[PDB]
Design a binder for this molecule. Structure first.
Ligand code: SF4
Lengths: 59, 283, 142, 58, 144, 48, 67, 64, 72, 50, 58, 93, 120, 63, 153, 132, 161
């Protein structure tokens, strides 16, 4: 069944998460909020707008 | 007897409910074992990255560290401080644990292979996450300690950004799937992994994965260097064990969702052999 | 196949792995195409989204253009003393070109098998739609 | 017990009344207003179910 | 042309009125030199904001309830069609439940009086006018 | 406490030589005696 | 800029066939929406609506069933 | 960007209740047994909204 | 006498092949029962109505099935 | 107990008996509604008595 | 990559649409008999209720 | 000669037990879920939400006819139970 | 989105929690604890806490919370349109673009006022 | 950043290559759209092979 | 109850009960949407309560005076005469065996319908007919955001 | 009037080309000026004729028993996905149309085609299936 | 008839308690610096399962490492009381043992045993990482053994009466 492939992918993702916990530091609360409140949301919205334009072009 | 048979309707029905409860308990035990294995894998990976051998004396080559950890967490006693409401201090762990085990319901292991026919798996997962965040915040607030209050405030601050980021990511993802069920994403991901379309949003996807799992650099509400222990500053034993188990289950479920929605789901990756793969087999 | 046959699902719930039936169907299709291969009226009636000459040109020049582009890319940014990296880039470009050519050829074949699907015999059309050579035995048994 | 329409209308009216019954706290007023808005949304959903109108559900 | 659009436009107008009320200057340049080391707690702006917000909430709830009830009655919220159906009811006597019509009319009238600040609900408007600038009062009167 | 010497470690000439020399009891007991690494059972070199 | 490019492409898609005409410039919605937005409308004059086919009579390919 | 000085400063005026710290000061302490307090410091820090307002480091906890 | 890759392949095979079998057969030991249920799900001749003007009778159909040896 | 308790118990027992008898003896047994009483046999036609 | 993925998704949707067109043709081939059975069920139930009402309100 | 694996290979390989334990636990949970889904219905039934309107109508026709149409077609005046514990309607009002 | 099956699952989850509670009681059966002076006191890194209930925060993220609520409402509004984008039309595209532009303008105005940063 | 002449030439080459790659990607997307349209036409032709029956609506349905 | 935390818990319970009622009426989509929105609002309200009512000591108010003085007779009178139900009836009014509208099915309509999502009415309403209402809602949201910024300033 | 959904669907698909007269009459009787269907009492005669034709067409040839069983298994595994079982359905339809020609086609069967058709919509998925 | 299962239960409990002897993240001076070095990759306390816990309410092993003064003794007593039961105590370093160099200091607690009960002591000043590991191993062995120390006497049926 595909459950084995799903488990392998989830295990890879969990290993990546554990490595990220081991490696990177912890940022500031205000810094992360501002990054979300100024850059990340706008980037996501622009990506969605570009996807909408591409879908319209490709019908 | 024609007159004795009637009085046995619910009497015969009860065994079916008992069997269903037994099956649910078996599923819960399997999920707990999976979570314990995930914790063991995390400890081993952390030791390996730190150039440390890690757990090796817990049984044969330290193969049963998780079972010993769970048993010891059971063993240690817990005392409620007199300065806090015992009712709330106890209800918070029980509510968190009840919400924690419910994550197994909104999970699919294959095509139409699910415990329930929930067409809004994403909504159910979001509700579970919101309940877990509320439980953490309440545990922080009920502790009546400044450190726990700061931890709860930081967790709430994370949640608002987490909620917005998750909603935007789902909306951008639902723009292709057009369904709140998890099967639709994997159905159209058999050609290529969904990360290909979101190639430029790979950094934001990784950020969301690290935030949905409450890992660094979104490791707030833990603040080991900053605010010592997290919402469990005064909570220990079974409360801390339940909180950690819920965190691990949430991480596992978020990784499963991320795989099912972005990394090709449970379909084998054919993107590498795309240059040699055919499109249509015309006779 | 990424999309599979347009007339049926590749393997819906049961995966069929019979090569004898596929070979018989291919032979029957070849025999049907050869029986009216000299029919000028049938030849003119056959229409495809892509011409055979254009399809052949695409399939024969796509690897060449891709290889040239890969060589130019390796010259532009890659150092020429990295044999592994240069060969990998060139092979990837050639594989992309081959994929483009294969897509063009598959499109031409599908158009030939679909835009002319109305001229097929009844049993031949049944075999093409169902993927089973048992629909038309006389064109493949002998 | 009571029919759904009657229950919903009586609940809306009782919530409107109870909005004044409790003490005068701004936070309590805001919570009561949120509850009343949710009850209004529920009533609109029930009405759209009763009459099968797209605008009612909108 | 319909009570839904009217309700949306009225809610927008109420939001604009609240925003304009929030735009009132809290401090002014005065020659009052004796109050430099003492605090004067003025609650006029807060009272105006609270009263406006609560009245707007109540009026919006009433108008929404009225619209929801009217839609179920005839199936439409437009201007002419509603009047035609209501006049037809007086001639066909299909719906004799005058209680529901009286309740809908009472809800609409109460909502309109509350939004307009009509008597006997007048202390709200009295307090509203008592804590605003003269130009703001002029604008509010012209709008209402 | 099972599988002191794994199949990968047991699939070496060193394991066979040690088992033939010191016996099964000594071969198994070394893994329980001074377990440092599964690949370091009886030494790192696989020749003996 | 993406929106402008998409609009330009849609405007240039007029040379494409009617099925290949831009969906923005040529709507294609469900049968219910088609019946609701084109009933008793004199601008289009879509003719009758075959209840068997759930499509307007003037609509191309209406009622095309198996022979 | 635009000027945001007022959003960063909040001085206290004589007998001005508005200008005072109109909030219960979270007099939390970075006491000895803290992972980041180095063990021998009790930094009583008046923090307002997780931002330290005043500092009083109780030292000498390890004075030998 | 064994390569590092050759020895490592044994553990990988032990981890993969049993896992592959378990994934391919989630319903262990009940496959025969499932096959029997599927066979009983195939209706027989009497359970269905047969047209009066049928090319082959029941006995002829059985003989032809035996000759062609269809698994069914 | 008491006379009222006895009356209530009798009424509840009669209600349970009547409901069960109606569900069992007076019902088209086309749907599996009585576990351990309705049969689990696999049906082939649309209407099969359970 | 975003453009190519959007195009591929569009192509997959078109292929699914063709498959759905074939399925719709099959369903329309199967439309009449089910509709006839459902109409027979609806009309048979109508006769019994109509007769009961006629005997009742008479 | 020494046939030991590479140092990075061994360093990564000192996780195989935990990885295999996690895989076994996940396989057990997945098999339990699959058995629960399959045993009641003798198959893995597709969700009605993943089926079109025609498919959904075709799937539930037999169940609807058996559970509702049959009792409604052969109703009796005394058939209804004296209590309120009857079968609820297909649409809850 | 849930059913009586989900309700019974919640009941079984509660049963599992009761089993866990029984296990906790069994584990606690093997321990003995002596009451201490500060045994039930607040843990504040070794000293008695100077507050019991007066733990108040500055709440510097009020504007952030309000903007989050507004953005959630806007996203919920946008969701139904994208849920059935396959039947998009010219008017639908115009409305979606207008909604996107409005959300972007709101975000920019929030950023333009420096309201996305904490204040004293 | 006072980059060298070689770095400037490399940057110019990279910009030209990026522009060319963008143009090529757009052309490939247009070609893919045309191919999809052709495939859709072929599929419609295949589907409408034996579905050419057109029964007029009965006169019982009024205008 | 006057305790703000208990009031919030009761509001959350009422919202959950309303969602359950909506699910009972087979309206699960709107139930889930309302549940999510209410959960977010409840999180914000809990943050505010920790901000403004950390102690939780509610005002010393007694409900007996107001309840006995006006509230009880007013509630009795209001519930006594208010009845806006014209023709709504209970489900147990008639035997379900006399109803057959849920058994009829439109096979041709199903064969002519390609809808696979329940959001079709929502799209057709908030995108086709009530587009003016949607634009008004967007403008109102922008104006409210501006007003909130001005209020914060 | 005693058939399951899948069996009745298979029988009607087989008779889709055989019940043309009654089907066309009923469809014409089903015509209306709006998408709302007409009252079922309007076409009692046409519906009765269609049902009679379906009952008369449900009797298949003996050679179609195996094909019908295979189609039933495919539909049950697919929970009634007709397009995914097009090959078996088409074969059964050809068998019902001509049992003799279908028997001759079955004479030229392959070894793989002579094995039991085991359908599993989980391990095997298909290619770009919306009904999945 | 309750000791039969209890003995296996006691053994399992002892194994579990030894497997999760989490040291308290509470260090003061050079002895604590050595203890932190004993948490390094080279000295794998994770091999024995020692993971530092910041909260006394969730800690089991109190690693008293450093010098105790008059300004820290009440805090140490409060932490010891706040430590969740069961608890073990190990005093590493001479200062934590008996003051060490500051044994004659006016600002020295003059011994950690006079403030909180101590189960084990380490001699070195600073003790080596190996010395701390040996002390931890001895404490773990004692804790595993102390659970069933044969306090109860065996009856004539070889049953603890
Ligand atoms: S005992 Fe020695 S090493 Fe330890 S803290 Fe005292 S002086 Fe330093």
């Amino acid at each position: 069944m595909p459950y084995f492939v799903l488990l392998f992918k989830i295990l890879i993702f969990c290993v990546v998460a554990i490595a990220t916990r081991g490696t990177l530091p912890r940022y500031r609360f205000d810094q992360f909020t501002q990054l979300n409140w100024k850059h990340f949301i706008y980037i996501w919205l622009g990506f969605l707008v570009f996807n909408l334009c591409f879908v319209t072009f490709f019908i | 007897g024609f007159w004795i048979a009637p009085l046995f309707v619910n009497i015969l029905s009860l065994p079916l409910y008992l069997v269903m409860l037994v099956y649910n308990i078996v599923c819960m035990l399997l999920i707990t074992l999976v979570i314990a294995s995930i914790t063991l894998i995390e400890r081993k990976v952390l030791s390996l990255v730190q150039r440390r051998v890690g757990p090796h004396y817990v049984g044969y080559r330290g193969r049963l560290q998780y079972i010993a950890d769970a048993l010891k967490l059971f063993i240690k006693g817990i005392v409620v401080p007199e300065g806090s409401n015992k009712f709330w201090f106890v209800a918070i762990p029980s509510a968190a644990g009840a919400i924690c085990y419910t994550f197994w319901i909104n999970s699919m292991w294959g095509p139409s292979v699910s415990i329930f026919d929930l067409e809004y798996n994403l909504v159910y997962a979001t509700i579970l996450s919101i309940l877990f965040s509320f439980c953490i915040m309440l545990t922080g607030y009920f502790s009546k300690s400044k450190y726990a209050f700061m931890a709860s405030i930081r967790c709430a601050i994370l949640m608002l950004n987490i909620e917005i980021f998750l909603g935007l990511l789902v909306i951008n993802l639902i723009f292709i799937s057009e369904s709140f069920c998890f099967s639709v994403f994997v159905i159209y991901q058999e050609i290529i992994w969904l990360i290909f379309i979101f190639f430029g949003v790979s950094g934001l996807i990784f950020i969301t994965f690290l935030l949905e799992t409450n890992r660094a650099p979104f490791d707030l509400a833990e603040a080991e260097s900053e605010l010592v222990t997290g919402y469990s500053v005064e909570y220990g034993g079974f409360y801390f064990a339940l909180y950690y188990l819920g965190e691990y289950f949430h991480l596992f479920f978020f990784s499963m969702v991320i795989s099912i929605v972005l990394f090709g789901g449970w379909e084998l990756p054919n993107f590498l052999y795309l240059f040699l793969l055919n499109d249509f087999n015309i006779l | 196949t990424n999309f599979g046959s347009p007339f049926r699902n590749t393997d819906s719930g049961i995966v069929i792995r019979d090569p004898e039936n596929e070979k018989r169907l291919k032979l029957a299709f070849q025999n049907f195409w050869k029986s009216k291969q000299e029919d000028k009226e049938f030849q003119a009636q056959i229409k495809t989204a892509v011409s055979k000459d254009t399809v052949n040109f695409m399939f024969y020049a796509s690897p060449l253009f891709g290889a040239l582009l890969g060589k130019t890319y390796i010259d532009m940014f890659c150092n020429p003393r990295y044999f592994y990296f240069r060969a990998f880039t060139l092979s990837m470009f050639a594989l992309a070109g081959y994929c483009v050519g294969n897509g063009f050829r598959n499109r031409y074949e599908h158009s030939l098998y679909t835009r002319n699907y109305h001229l097929f015999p009844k049993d031949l059309q049944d075999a093409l739609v169902n993927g089973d050579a048992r629909y038309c035995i006389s064109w493949w048994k002998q | 017990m009571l029919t759904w329409i009657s229950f919903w209308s009586l609940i809306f009216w009782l919530i409107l009344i109870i909005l004044v019954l409790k003490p005068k706290n701004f936070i309590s007023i805001l919570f009561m207003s949120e509850l009343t808005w949710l009850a209004l949304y529920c009533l609109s959903l029930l009405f759209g179910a009763i009459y099968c109108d797209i605008t009612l559900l909108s | 042309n319909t009570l839904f659009t009217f309700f949306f436009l009225i809610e927008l107008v109420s939001c604009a009125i609240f925003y304009k009320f929030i735009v009132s200057k809290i401090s002014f340049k005065n020659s009052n030199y004796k109050d430099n080391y003492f605090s004067i707690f003025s609650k006029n702006y807060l009272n105006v904001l609270f009263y406006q917000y609560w009245s707007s909430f109540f009026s919006s709830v009433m108008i929404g309830f009225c619209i929801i009830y009217l839609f179920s009655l005839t199936g439409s919220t437009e201007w002419s069609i509603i009047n035609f159906i209501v006049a037809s009811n007086n001639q066909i006597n299909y719906y004799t439940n005058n209680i529901t019509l009286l309740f809908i009319c009472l809800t609409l009238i109460i909502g309109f009086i509350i939004k307009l600040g009509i008597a006997p609900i007048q202390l709200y408007k009295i307090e509203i006018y008592k804590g605003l600038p003269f130009l703001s009062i002029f604008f509010y009167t012209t709008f209402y | 406490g099972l599988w002191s010497w794994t199949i990968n470690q047991m699939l070496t000439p060193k394991f066979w030589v040690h088992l033939r020399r010191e016996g099964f009891i000594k071969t198994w007991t070394r893994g329980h005696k001074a377990s440092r690494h599964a690949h370091y059972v009886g030494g790192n070199r696989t020749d003996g | 800029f993406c929106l402008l490019f998409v609009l330009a492409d849609a405007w240039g898609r007029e040379k494409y066939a009617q099925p290949y005409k831009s969906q923005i410039l040529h709507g294609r919605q469900p049968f219910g929406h088609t019946f609701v937005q084109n009933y008793r409308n004199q601008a289009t004059d879509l003719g009758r609506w075959n209840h068997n086919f759930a499509c307007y009579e003037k609509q191309p390919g209406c009622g095309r069933d198996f022979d | 960007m635009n000027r945001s000085i007022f959003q960063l400063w909040k001085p206290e005026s004589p007998r001005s209740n508005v200008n005072s710290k109109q909030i219960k000061t979270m007099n939390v302490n970075f006491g000895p047994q803290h992972p980041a307090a180095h063990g021998v410091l009790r930094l009583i820090l008046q923090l307002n909204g997780e931002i330290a307002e005043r500092f009083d480091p109780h030292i000498g906890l390890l004075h030998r | 006498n064994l390569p590092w890759f050759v020895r490592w392949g044994t553990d990988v095979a032990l981890f993969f092949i049993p896992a592959y079998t378990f994934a391919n057969y989630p319903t262990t030991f009940f496959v025969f029962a499932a096959e029997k249920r599927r066979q009983r799900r195939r209706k027989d001749f009497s359970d269905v109505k047969l047209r009066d003007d049928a090319a082959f009778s029941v006995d002829q159909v059985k003989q032809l099935q035996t000759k062609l040896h269809l698994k069914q | 107990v008491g006379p009222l308790n006895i009356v209530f118990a009798g009424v509840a027992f009669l209600m349970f008996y009547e409901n069960n008898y109606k569900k069992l003896y007076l019902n088209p047994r086309y749907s599996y509604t009585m576990p351990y009483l309705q049969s689990a046999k696999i049906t082939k036609n649309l209407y099969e008595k359970l | 990559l975003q453009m190519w993925g959007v195009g591929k998704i569009i192509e997959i949707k078109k292929f699914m649409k063709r498959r759905d067109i074939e399925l719709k043709g099959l369903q329309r081939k199967a439309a009449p008999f089910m509709q006839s059975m459902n109409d027979v069920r609806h009309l048979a139930l109508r006769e019994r209720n109509d007769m009961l009402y006629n005997e009742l309100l008479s | 000669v020494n046939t030991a694996y590479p140092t990075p290979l061994k360093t990564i390989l000192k996780t195989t037990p935990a990885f295999v334990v996690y895989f076994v636990f996940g396989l057990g949970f997945s098999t339990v879920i699959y058995d629960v889904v399959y045993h009641p219905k003798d198959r893995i039934e597709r969700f009605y939400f993943r089926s079109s309107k025609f498919e959904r109508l075709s799937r539930k026709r037999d169940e609807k006819l058996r559970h509702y149409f049959k009792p409604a077609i052969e109703w009796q005046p005394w058939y209804n139970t004296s209590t309120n514990n009857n079968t609820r309607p297909l649409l809850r009002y | 989105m849930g059913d009586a099956v989900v309700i019974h699952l919640i009941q079984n989850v509660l049963i599992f929690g009761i089993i866990f509670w029984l296990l906790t009681w069994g584990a606690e059966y093997f321990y003995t604890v002596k009451q201490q002076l500060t045994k039930k006191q607040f843990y504040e890194c070794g000293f008695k806490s100077i507050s019991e209930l007066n733990i108040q925060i500055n709440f510097n993220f009020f504007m952030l919370a309000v903007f989050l609520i507004l953005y959630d409402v806007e996203f919920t509004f946008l969701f139904p349109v994208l849920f059935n984008f396959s039947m998009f039309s010219t008017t639908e595209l115009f409305l979606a673009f207008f909604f996107i532009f409005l959300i972007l303008v709101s975000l920019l105005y929030d950023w333009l006022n420096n309201v996305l940063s904490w204040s004293a | 950043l006072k980059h060298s002449a070689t770095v400037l030439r490399e940057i110019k080459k990279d910009t030209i290559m990026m522009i060319l790659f963008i143009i090529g990607g757009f052309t490939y997307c247009y070609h893919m759209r045309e191919t999809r349209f052709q495939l859709d036409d072929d599929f419609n032709e295949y589907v409408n092979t034996n579905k050419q029956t057109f029964r007029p609506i009965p006169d019982h349905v009024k205008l | 109850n006057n305790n703000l935390y208990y009031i919030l818990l009761y509001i959350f319970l009422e919202i959950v009960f309303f969602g359950l009622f909506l699910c009972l009426y087979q309206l699960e989509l709107f139930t889930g949407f309302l549940w999510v929105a209410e959960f977010a609002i409840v999180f914000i309200a809990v943050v505010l309560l920790f901000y403004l009512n950390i102690d939780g000591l509610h005002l010393k108010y007694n409900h007996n005076i107001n309840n006995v003085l006006y509230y009880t007779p007013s509630l009795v009178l209001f519930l006594i005469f208010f009845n806006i139900d014209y023709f709504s009836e209970l489900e147990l009014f008639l035997p379900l065996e006399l109803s057959f509208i849920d058994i009829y099915d439109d096979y041709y309509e199903g064969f002519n319908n390609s809808i696979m999502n329940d959001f079709t009415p929502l799209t057709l309403s908030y995108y086709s007919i009530n587009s003016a209402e949607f634009i008004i809602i967007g403008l109102l949201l922008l104006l409210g955001s501006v007003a909130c910024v001005n209020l914060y300033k | 009037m005693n058939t399951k959904s899948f069996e009745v669907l298979i029988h009607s698909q087989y008779a889709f080309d055989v019940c043309r007269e009654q089907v066309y009459n009923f469809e014409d009787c089903r015509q209306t000026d709006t998408p709302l269907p007409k009252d079922p009492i309007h076409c009692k005669a046409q519906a009765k004729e269609v049902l009679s034709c379906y009952k008369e067409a449900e009797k298949m040839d003996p050679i179609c028993l195996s094909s019908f069983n295979d189609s039933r298994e495919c539909m049950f595994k697919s929970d009634g996905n007709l397009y995914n079982c097009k090959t078996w359905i088409n074969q059964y339809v050809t068998c019902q149309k001509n049992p003799a020609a279908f028997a001759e086609f079955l004479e030229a069967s392959t070894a793989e085609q002579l094995k039991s058709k085991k359908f599993d919509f989980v391990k095997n998925r298909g290619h770009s299936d919306k009904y999945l | 008839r309750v000791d039969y299962i209890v003995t296996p239960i006691n053994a399992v409990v002892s194994w579990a308690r030894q497997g999760s002897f989490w040291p308290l993240t509470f260090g003061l001076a050079c002895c604590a610096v050595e203890m932190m070095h004993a948490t390094v990759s080279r000295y794998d306390f994770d091999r024995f399962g020692v993971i530092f816990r910041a909260t006394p309410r969730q800690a089991d092993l109190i690693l008293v490492a450093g010098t105790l003064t008059n300004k820290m003794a009440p805090g140490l007593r409060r932490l010891y009381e706040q430590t969740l039961d069961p608890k073990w105590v190990l005093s590493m370093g001479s200062c934590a043992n008996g003051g060490g160099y500051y044994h004659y200091s006016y600002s020295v607690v003059r011994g950690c045993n006079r403030i909180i009960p101590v189960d084990i002591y380490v001699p070195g000043c600073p003790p080596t990482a190996e010395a701390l590991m040996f002390g931890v191993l001895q404490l773990q062995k004692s804790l595993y053994r102390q659970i069933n120390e044969g306090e109860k006497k065996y009856n004539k049926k070889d049953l603890t009466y």
